[PDB]
Design a protein around this ligand. Structure first.
Ligand SMILES: NS(=O)(=O)c1cc(-c2ccccc2)cc(-c2ccccc2)c1
Ligand SMILES: NS(=O)(=O)c1cc(-c2ccccc2)cc(-c2ccccc2)c1
Ligand SMILES: [Zn+2]
Ligand SMILES: [Zn+2]
Lengths: 251, 251
C-alpha cells in the first residue's frame, strides 16, 4: 500500500471498506455534548533521556516507538498503554492533517496509539470495541520554535531515506500534545492505514499545538517514501460518519 | 459460592473486590445525558414455538438459554448476540432487584446477557471492555397478569429442585422488556456473580414491566437452592461507582 497510488486498500485489507472508518470531518454543531467525558489522564509520559527511543521513517510516516510505563485513561476503568506516535503532514502551501473541522484541513496531525490494558498484544485488540485508542492533535504555525518537536524534527535529516531509523533521547511525550486535556471530540472509527480495523476510540483535542514555519517546512520537506518520491500528503481522505455521532466534552 | 455465605466473595474470586463492579444505585439527577445514545435495536427476538428452549434452576437463579439469531446493537457497529436471560428476586413482600434507583429496590430484575460479535467465545469476552452487554429491566407490581412472564412462571413448579431443568416453547423475548427502547441508563461494570469480571456494558431501561402480586409470589416462593434453602434474595449488594458516571439516553 502507498497513499495517492495503488495497491486498492480493500484488495490489501477488507476492513478498509468498513462503514465506520477514520478520519472524519468534525462538524462541532452536529457533535453531542456528553458531560461524562472527563479530562484525559496521562501517567509516566515524562521520560528520562535513557533509554533512547527509536525514530523511524517507515516511508508512510515518521514514528516514535514508546517504551513500557506510559498509561493513559479515557475515564475511570478505561485504561490504555501508549505504543507509539507518528505524524501526518502535507507539503509547501498544502495542509496534511487527517481529521478536518467544518472542512478545514490543518497543516499537520500527531497520533499517539494506545492498547487497552485488557489485551497483551495489538493483534488481540484489532476490531475489538475499545481495544485501541488514539489521541489526535492538530499542528499549526505559531511564532516560537516548539522545543519538544525540535528534539524529533532536528533528526529527520538522519532518516531522510525510507526504512531509515535513529535513536533519540527520551523526552516529555506529553509536551508534543496540547496542555488542555479537558476539551476534545471523541468518536469510534478505524485505523487510517491497512488493515483499517474498526472499534478504535479516537480523541481529537480542541486545542492545537504550535510549531514554527521552519519546523513545519522541516517535517514536510525532509523525508522520502516509496521510490524517489518526497514523503508528503501522507493523509487518508475524510470518511463519512455514516450515522455515527461525534461526542464533545463541552457544550 | 452462595449469595453472601461462605463462600468469601473476594476469596472465591478477588475480582469481586475490583474498583468497577455491579450492581450500582442509579441517581437520575447525576446521570450524564448523551444525545449519542440511540434507541436499542433488538432483531430476531420474536421466537417461534419450536424449537423449545432450556429453562433451568442452577440453584442461584432461573435461566433461559436463547438460540442463535437474537441480534442487539448499543450503537453503530456495536453489535451483540443474546446468550441467555435470568432473573433476580426477593421474598415474602421483600424486593430483590440488583440495581436500585435513589435507594428504591424493585420487586425483581430481568437480565438478558449478550456477547459482542467481535468475540467468538464468552471466555475471550470476560474482562474485556464491551465484550459482554446486559439489558436490565425492573419488574414492579401492577394490577394485570403479565402474559409474556406467565409463559415462564407457569413452568417453575416443574424445576423447584436445584439442578432441575425443563423445555419450554419459543416466546417473544422482547415482550419481557419495557415499552420505550430510547430511554435507558448505561454504565460499565461487572458480572454480579463470581467471577465478577469487569468490562460489562450494563443498559438499565428507565421504565418498568408490571407483574400481578400472584406472579411475583409465584417467582419468589417456588424454587429451592443450596441445602433446604428457598432460592430467594438472589441479589448482590449495591457497589460504589468510584468515579464512573452513569449516562442517560434522555434529557
Ligand atoms: N493513523 S493510525 O493512528 O490509525 C495508525 C497509523 C500507523 C502508521 C504509522 C506510521 C506510518 C503509517 C501508518 C500505525 C498505527 C498502529 C496501529 C496499531 C499499533 C501500532 C500502530 C496506527
Ligand atoms: N448478574 S449477571 O448478568 O452479571 C450474570 C451473568 C451471567 C453470564 C451468563 C452467560 C455468559 C456470561 C455471563 C450469569 C449469571 C449467573 C446467574 C446465576 C447463576 C450463575 C450465573 C449472572
Ligand atoms: Zn495516524
Ligand atoms: Zn443477573
Amino acid at each position: 500500500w502507498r497513499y495517492g497510488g495503488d495497491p486498492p486498500w480493500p484488495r490489501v485489507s477488507p476492513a478498509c471498506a468498513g462503514r465506520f472508518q477514520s478520519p472524519v470531518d468534525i462538524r462541532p454543531q452536529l457533535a453531542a455534548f456528553s458531560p461524562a467525558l472527563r479530562p484525559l489522564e496521562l501517567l509516566g509520559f515524562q521520560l528520562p533521556p535513557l533509554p533512547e527511543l527509536r525514530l523511524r521513517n517507515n516511508g508512510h510516516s515518521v514514528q516514535l516507538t514508546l517504551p513500557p510505563g506510559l498509561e493513559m485513561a479515557l475515564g475511570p476503568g478505561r485504561e490504555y498503554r501508549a505504543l507509539q506516535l507518528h505524524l501526518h503532514w502535507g507539503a509547501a502551501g498544502r495542509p496534511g492533517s487527517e481529521h478536518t473541522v467544518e472542512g478545514h484541513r490543518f497543516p499537520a496531525e500527531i497520533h499517539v496509539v494506545h492498547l487497552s490494558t485488557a489485551f497483551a498484544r495489538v493483534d488481540e485488540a484489532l476490531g475489538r470495541p475499545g481495544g485501541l485508542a488514539v489521541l489526535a492533535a492538530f499542528l499549526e504555525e505559531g511564532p516560537e520554535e516548539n522545543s519538544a518537536y525540535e528534539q524529533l524534527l532536528s533528526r529527520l535529516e538522519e532518516i531522510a531515506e525510507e526504512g531509515s531509523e535513529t535513536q533519540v533521547p527520551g523526552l516529555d511525550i506529553s509536551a508534543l500534545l496540547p496542555s488542555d486535556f479537558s476539551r476534545y471530540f471523541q468518536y469510534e472509527g478505524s485505523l487510517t492505514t491497512p488493515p483499517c480495523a474498526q472499534g478504535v476510540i479516537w480523541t481529537v483535542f480542541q486545542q492545537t499545538v504550535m510549531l514554527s514555519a521552519k519546523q513545519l517546512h522541516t517535517l514536510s520537506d525532509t523525508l522520502w517514501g516509496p521510490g524517489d518520491s518526497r514523503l508528503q500528503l501522507n493523509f487518508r481522505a475524510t470518511q463519512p460518519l455514516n450515522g455515527r455521532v461525534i461526542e464533545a466534552s463541552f457544550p
